[PDB]
Amino acid sequence: AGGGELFATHCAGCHPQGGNTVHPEKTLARARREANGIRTVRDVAAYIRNPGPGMPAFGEAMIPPADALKIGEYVVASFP
Ligand code: HEC
């Protein structure tokens, strides 16, 4: 699913079935994404850039921001 092909390689290895392999308390569930407030496409492009501890990072070396706005979508076809 375009963005899925990317998320299923640069995320799949940590975000298996909208799950987590590091933190079993921080899922992609809106219920949670709401508390922190992460229910947007952009948000799912910037942070990824320079996110906090626990999660790696993704510069414009491999995946360009413009290509990130495409990923944010993948996270809007299951649990916006
Ligand atoms: C393990 C090496 C990870 C990879 C690869 C990716 N993410 Fe991640 N993600 C990870 C953790 C441990 C957490 C919990 C938050 C923390 O305190 O670290 C998360 C959380 C998210 C969330 C939910 C909250 C948020 O900050 O957005 C989202 C939406 C998210 N992660 C997105 C995401 C994407 C799009 C990734 C591939 C580009 C990706 N993550 C990789 C661990 C890991």
PDB file of C-alpha atoms and ligand atoms in Angstrom:
ATOM      1  CA  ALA A   1       0.000   0.000   0.000  1.00  0.00           C
ATOM      2  CA  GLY A   2       2.695   2.422  -1.093  1.00  0.00           C
ATOM      3  CA  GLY A   3       3.351   3.912   2.324  1.00  0.00           C
ATOM      4  CA  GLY A   4       2.872   0.417   3.693  1.00  0.00           C
ATOM      5  CA  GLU A   5       5.812  -0.815   1.654  1.00  0.00           C
ATOM      6  CA  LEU A   6       7.918   1.700   3.542  1.00  0.00           C
ATOM      7  CA  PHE A   7       6.279   1.239   6.923  1.00  0.00           C
ATOM      8  CA  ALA A   8       6.581  -2.503   6.431  1.00  0.00           C
ATOM      9  CA  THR A   9      10.357  -2.260   6.542  1.00  0.00           C
ATOM     10  CA  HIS A  10      11.313   0.900   8.392  1.00  0.00           C
ATOM     11  CA  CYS A  11       8.619   0.366  10.996  1.00  0.00           C
ATOM     12  CA  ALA A  12       7.367  -3.185  10.614  1.00  0.00           C
ATOM     13  CA  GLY A  13      10.568  -4.001  12.460  1.00  0.00           C
ATOM     14  CA  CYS A  14       9.158  -2.437  15.606  1.00  0.00           C
ATOM     15  CA  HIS A  15       5.555  -1.690  14.721  1.00  0.00           C
ATOM     16  CA  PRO A  16       4.336  -5.221  13.989  1.00  0.00           C
ATOM     17  CA  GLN A  17       0.579  -5.122  13.481  1.00  0.00           C
ATOM     18  CA  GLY A  18       0.245  -1.614  14.860  1.00  0.00           C
ATOM     19  CA  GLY A  19       1.879  -3.105  17.931  1.00  0.00           C
ATOM     20  CA  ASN A  20       5.213  -2.595  19.651  1.00  0.00           C
ATOM     21  CA  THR A  21       8.308  -4.673  20.302  1.00  0.00           C
ATOM     22  CA  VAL A  22       9.832  -2.229  22.757  1.00  0.00           C
ATOM     23  CA  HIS A  23       6.977  -0.629  24.658  1.00  0.00           C
ATOM     24  CA  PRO A  24       3.811  -2.685  25.150  1.00  0.00           C
ATOM     25  CA  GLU A  25       2.158   0.392  26.628  1.00  0.00           C
ATOM     26  CA  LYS A  26       2.612   2.709  23.670  1.00  0.00           C
ATOM     27  CA  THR A  27       0.562   1.483  20.734  1.00  0.00           C
ATOM     28  CA  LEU A  28      -0.717   3.227  17.628  1.00  0.00           C
ATOM     29  CA  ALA A  29      -4.119   3.332  19.284  1.00  0.00           C
ATOM     30  CA  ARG A  30      -5.710   6.757  19.024  1.00  0.00           C
ATOM     31  CA  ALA A  31      -6.871   6.408  22.610  1.00  0.00           C
ATOM     32  CA  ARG A  32      -3.193   6.809  23.412  1.00  0.00           C
ATOM     33  CA  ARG A  33      -2.142   8.936  20.464  1.00  0.00           C
ATOM     34  CA  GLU A  34      -4.807  11.284  21.772  1.00  0.00           C
ATOM     35  CA  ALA A  35      -3.314  11.712  25.223  1.00  0.00           C
ATOM     36  CA  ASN A  36      -0.053  12.853  23.676  1.00  0.00           C
ATOM     37  CA  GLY A  37      -1.864  14.153  20.617  1.00  0.00           C
ATOM     38  CA  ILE A  38      -0.628  12.422  17.487  1.00  0.00           C
ATOM     39  CA  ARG A  39      -3.586  12.185  15.138  1.00  0.00           C
ATOM     40  CA  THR A  40      -2.219  13.898  12.052  1.00  0.00           C
ATOM     41  CA  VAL A  41      -0.251  13.128   8.912  1.00  0.00           C
ATOM     42  CA  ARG A  42       2.424  15.763   9.395  1.00  0.00           C
ATOM     43  CA  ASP A  43       3.050  14.802  13.002  1.00  0.00           C
ATOM     44  CA  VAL A  44       3.813  11.436  11.448  1.00  0.00           C
ATOM     45  CA  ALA A  45       6.704  12.904   9.494  1.00  0.00           C
ATOM     46  CA  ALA A  46       8.359  15.550  11.636  1.00  0.00           C
ATOM     47  CA  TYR A  47       8.724  13.650  14.899  1.00  0.00           C
ATOM     48  CA  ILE A  48       9.991  10.602  13.029  1.00  0.00           C
ATOM     49  CA  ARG A  49      12.750  12.973  11.981  1.00  0.00           C
ATOM     50  CA  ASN A  50      13.942  13.867  15.460  1.00  0.00           C
ATOM     51  CA  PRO A  51      11.905  11.690  17.829  1.00  0.00           C
ATOM     52  CA  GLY A  52      12.721  10.981  21.464  1.00  0.00           C
ATOM     53  CA  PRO A  53      14.425   8.005  23.115  1.00  0.00           C
ATOM     54  CA  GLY A  54      13.053   4.535  22.436  1.00  0.00           C
ATOM     55  CA  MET A  55      12.581   5.315  18.763  1.00  0.00           C
ATOM     56  CA  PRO A  56      15.379   5.599  16.197  1.00  0.00           C
ATOM     57  CA  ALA A  57      15.335   8.398  13.639  1.00  0.00           C
ATOM     58  CA  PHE A  58      14.890   9.019   9.932  1.00  0.00           C
ATOM     59  CA  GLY A  59      16.646  11.859   8.149  1.00  0.00           C
ATOM     60  CA  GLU A  60      16.254  13.052   4.579  1.00  0.00           C
ATOM     61  CA  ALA A  61      19.147  10.788   3.669  1.00  0.00           C
ATOM     62  CA  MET A  62      16.976   7.716   3.252  1.00  0.00           C
ATOM     63  CA  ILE A  63      13.413   8.978   3.444  1.00  0.00           C
ATOM     64  CA  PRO A  64      12.700  12.575   2.420  1.00  0.00           C
ATOM     65  CA  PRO A  65      10.122  14.635   4.334  1.00  0.00           C
ATOM     66  CA  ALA A  66       8.008  14.719   1.186  1.00  0.00           C
ATOM     67  CA  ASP A  67       8.138  10.938   1.313  1.00  0.00           C
ATOM     68  CA  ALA A  68       7.224  11.120   4.982  1.00  0.00           C
ATOM     69  CA  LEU A  69       3.935  12.880   4.336  1.00  0.00           C
ATOM     70  CA  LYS A  70       3.126   9.692   2.463  1.00  0.00           C
ATOM     71  CA  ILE A  71       3.819   7.538   5.497  1.00  0.00           C
ATOM     72  CA  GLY A  72       1.585   9.597   7.755  1.00  0.00           C
ATOM     73  CA  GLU A  73      -1.170   8.336   5.488  1.00  0.00           C
ATOM     74  CA  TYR A  74      -0.572   4.678   6.294  1.00  0.00           C
ATOM     75  CA  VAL A  75      -1.420   5.734   9.837  1.00  0.00           C
ATOM     76  CA  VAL A  76      -4.760   7.091   8.684  1.00  0.00           C
ATOM     77  CA  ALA A  77      -6.299   4.009   7.117  1.00  0.00           C
ATOM     78  CA  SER A  78      -6.820   1.984  10.273  1.00  0.00           C
ATOM     79  CA  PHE A  79      -6.688   4.291  13.270  1.00  0.00           C
ATOM     80  CA  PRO A  80      -6.670   8.002  12.420  1.00  0.00           C
TER      81      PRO A  80
HETATM   82  C1  HEC B   1      11.805   0.358  17.116  1.00  0.00           C
HETATM   83  C2  HEC B   1      13.281   0.465  16.746  1.00  0.00           C
HETATM   84  C3  HEC B   1      10.923   1.338  16.401  1.00  0.00           C
HETATM   85  C4  HEC B   1      10.889   1.616  15.080  1.00  0.00           C
HETATM   86  C5  HEC B   1      11.725   1.016  13.988  1.00  0.00           C
HETATM   87  C6  HEC B   1       9.876   2.627  14.884  1.00  0.00           C
HETATM   88  N1  HEC B   1       9.293   2.963  16.094  1.00  0.00           N
HETATM   89 FE1  HEC B   1       7.732   4.090  16.447  1.00  0.00          FE
HETATM   90  N2  HEC B   1       7.680   3.653  18.353  1.00  0.00           N
HETATM   91  C7  HEC B   1       8.661   2.938  19.020  1.00  0.00           C
HETATM   92  C8  HEC B   1       8.506   3.087  20.447  1.00  0.00           C
HETATM   93  C9  HEC B   1       9.391   2.451  21.478  1.00  0.00           C
HETATM   94  C10 HEC B   1       7.438   3.887  20.650  1.00  0.00           C
HETATM   95  C11 HEC B   1       6.861   4.347  21.957  1.00  0.00           C
HETATM   96  C12 HEC B   1       7.123   5.819  22.268  1.00  0.00           C
HETATM   97  C13 HEC B   1       8.443   5.998  23.003  1.00  0.00           C
HETATM   98  O1  HEC B   1       8.392   6.495  24.148  1.00  0.00           O
HETATM   99  O2  HEC B   1       9.479   5.634  22.405  1.00  0.00           O
HETATM  100  C14 HEC B   1       6.921   4.242  19.349  1.00  0.00           C
HETATM  101  C15 HEC B   1       5.804   5.069  19.133  1.00  0.00           C
HETATM  102  C16 HEC B   1       5.339   5.456  17.880  1.00  0.00           C
HETATM  103  C17 HEC B   1       4.079   6.123  17.653  1.00  0.00           C
HETATM  104  C18 HEC B   1       3.096   6.492  18.726  1.00  0.00           C
HETATM  105  C19 HEC B   1       3.443   7.778  19.470  1.00  0.00           C
HETATM  106  C20 HEC B   1       4.266   8.712  18.595  1.00  0.00           C
HETATM  107  O3  HEC B   1       5.289   9.217  19.107  1.00  0.00           O
HETATM  108  O4  HEC B   1       3.858   8.904  17.429  1.00  0.00           O
HETATM  109  C21 HEC B   1       3.976   6.335  16.323  1.00  0.00           C
HETATM  110  C22 HEC B   1       2.853   6.994  15.577  1.00  0.00           C
HETATM  111  C23 HEC B   1       5.173   5.802  15.715  1.00  0.00           C
HETATM  112  N3  HEC B   1       6.004   5.264  16.681  1.00  0.00           N
HETATM  113  C24 HEC B   1       5.446   5.830  14.335  1.00  0.00           C
HETATM  114  C25 HEC B   1       6.509   5.171  13.729  1.00  0.00           C
HETATM  115  C26 HEC B   1       6.742   5.144  12.304  1.00  0.00           C
HETATM  116  C27 HEC B   1       5.877   5.820  11.280  1.00  0.00           C
HETATM  117  C28 HEC B   1       7.857   4.413  12.097  1.00  0.00           C
HETATM  118  C29 HEC B   1       8.520   4.087  10.791  1.00  0.00           C
HETATM  119  C30 HEC B   1       8.782   5.303   9.906  1.00  0.00           C
HETATM  120  C31 HEC B   1       8.327   3.979  13.392  1.00  0.00           C
HETATM  121  N4  HEC B   1       7.490   4.450  14.388  1.00  0.00           N
HETATM  122  C32 HEC B   1       9.472   3.188  13.601  1.00  0.00           C
HETATM  123  C33 HEC B   1       9.659   2.180  18.416  1.00  0.00           C
HETATM  124  C34 HEC B   1       9.931   2.175  17.036  1.00  0.00           C
END
